[PDB]
């Protein structure tokens, strides 16, 4: 096993298409993107619940306010 690890590292050094990392295929960047977009949207729409209390309004209307 030890010899094979050495040999693999050596042939990777000799080859040009060798992987830039010893890690296996990574497949958890999609979930990170999805949760980022989710938190972004959840904040954006937990804002306007507070920012649209809308106590009262003052519309200028012809005949009354003028």
């Amino acid at each position: 096993k030890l010899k094979l690890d050495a040999y693999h590292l050596l042939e990777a050094s000799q080859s040009e298409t060798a992987a830039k990392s010893a890690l296996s295929d990574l497949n958890w960047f999609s979930d990170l993107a999805d949760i980022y977009s989710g938190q972004q949207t959840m904040a954006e729409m937990d804002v306007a619940l507070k920012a649209q209390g809308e106590q009262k309004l003052s519309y200028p209307i012809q005949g009354k306010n003028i």
Binding site: L4, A6, Y7, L9, L10, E11
Partner: protein
């Protein structure tokens, strides 16, 4: 004596290569490198 000479050369030429884990004619049976792709 022939066998002695053969092994005495095998030592020097195989034991410090890092490329000959076995003989190249049987490299099909080895596992595959995870780093190649």
């Amino acid at each position: 004596g022939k066998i002695h000479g053969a092994v005495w050369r095998m030592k020097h030429l195989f034991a410090t290569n890092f490329k000959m884990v076995g003989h190249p004619r049987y490299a099909y049976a080895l596992p595959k490198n995870p780093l190649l792709q």
